């Protein structure tokens, strides 16, 4: 009925605000990106610092893992993405084409494509093997805040400050669905549900919404947290109870019951906006990370 997440570790090392944290698909690692231009890798279970990956010329807004846990991609203010060999820390490829900050990135499940979103209002799709841009989508009329592939990589969902969430056919680059709200708040984050049937979209009016995008139907609204300013990550937690997990501008991590929408836990400890949270693929572990007053990542563990 309610989880009992407790703080296990606080991970310090970044020298500016942290921007995103992501667990490796194999569950061994956490990767973090920062405005400090660095990616850092941490042990998921003991919180032990592992290595720093460097090479971007400006801050990084996002990082994402390949399905084999062997590669990372990062999205930077320097207008590029970089693909990294996790093992060696070496930059394999630099993906060039965006004309403004790259804000968000993700690999497909097959890990042969990367999708990116940028302040240049486009979504791009890249070949992992060659580093070539395969498609540029004129996706939105304002910065693209999030991009995510579904369970088999056949669709991309994008979100933007323009107030829209769009679903795209990966192979053709065609927009299959636009979700709209008559009051048109900026959409600050989106991702598919693990089963691929739903999208979870954050808007800058302190709400998260679960949509059946095929039917154009909003099914659940999660409220009570603070989110009017930043592009904060949200998550489905499915290892124990079925929850929704998000950061918040009141410095807390919020956890809701997915079905009932009840807040079941708030995690206190950070001293700035919790910009990013991530859920461990197999264990009931959450990672959270915070902005400039804080600069730390925390690891939390629950029995359910």
């Amino acid at each position: 009925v309610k989880p009992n997440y407790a703080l296990k570790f606080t991970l310090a090392g970044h020298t500016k605000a942290v921007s995103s944290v992501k667990f490796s698909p194999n569950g061994e690692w956490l990767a973090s990106s920062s405005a400090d231009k660095l990616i850092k890798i941490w042990g998921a279970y003991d919180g032990k610092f592992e290595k720093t990956i460097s090479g971007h010329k400006l801050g990084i807004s996002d990082v994402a893992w390949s399905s084999d846990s062997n590669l990372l991609v990062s999205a930077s203010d320097d207008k590029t993405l970089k693909i990294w060999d996790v093992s060696s820390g070496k930059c394999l490829k630099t993906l060039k084409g965006h004309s403004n900050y790259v804000f968000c990135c993700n690999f497909n499940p097959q890990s042969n494509l990367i999708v990116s979103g940028s302040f240049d209002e486009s979504v791009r799709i890249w070949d992992v093997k060659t580093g070539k841009c395969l498609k540029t989508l004129p996706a939105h009329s304002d910065p693209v805040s999030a991009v995510h592939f579904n369970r088999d990589g056949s669709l991309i969902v994008s979100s933007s400050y323009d107030g829209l969430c769009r679903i795209w056919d990966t192979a053709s680059g065609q927009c299959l669905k636009t979700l709209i709200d008559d009051d048109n708040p900026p959409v600050s984050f989106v991702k598919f549900s693990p089963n691929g049937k739903y999208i979870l979209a954050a808007t800058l009016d302190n709400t998260l919404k679960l949509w059946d995008y095929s039917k154009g139907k909003c099914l659940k609204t999660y409220t009570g947290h603070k989110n009017e300013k930043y592009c904060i990550f949200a998550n489905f937690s499915v290892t124990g109870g079925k929850w929704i997990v998000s950061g918040s501008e009141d410095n807390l991590v919020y956890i809701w019951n997915l079905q009932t929408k009840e807040i079941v836990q708030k995690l206190q400890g950070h001293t700035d906006v919790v910009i990013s949270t991530a859920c461990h693929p197999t264990e009931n572990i959450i990672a959270s990370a915070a902005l400039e007053n804080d600069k730390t990542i925390k690891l939390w563990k629950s029995d359910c």
Partner: peptide
């Protein structure tokens, strides 16, 4: 960009 307010 993510760590500042741009909206």
């Amino acid at each position: 960009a993510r760590t500042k307010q741009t909206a």
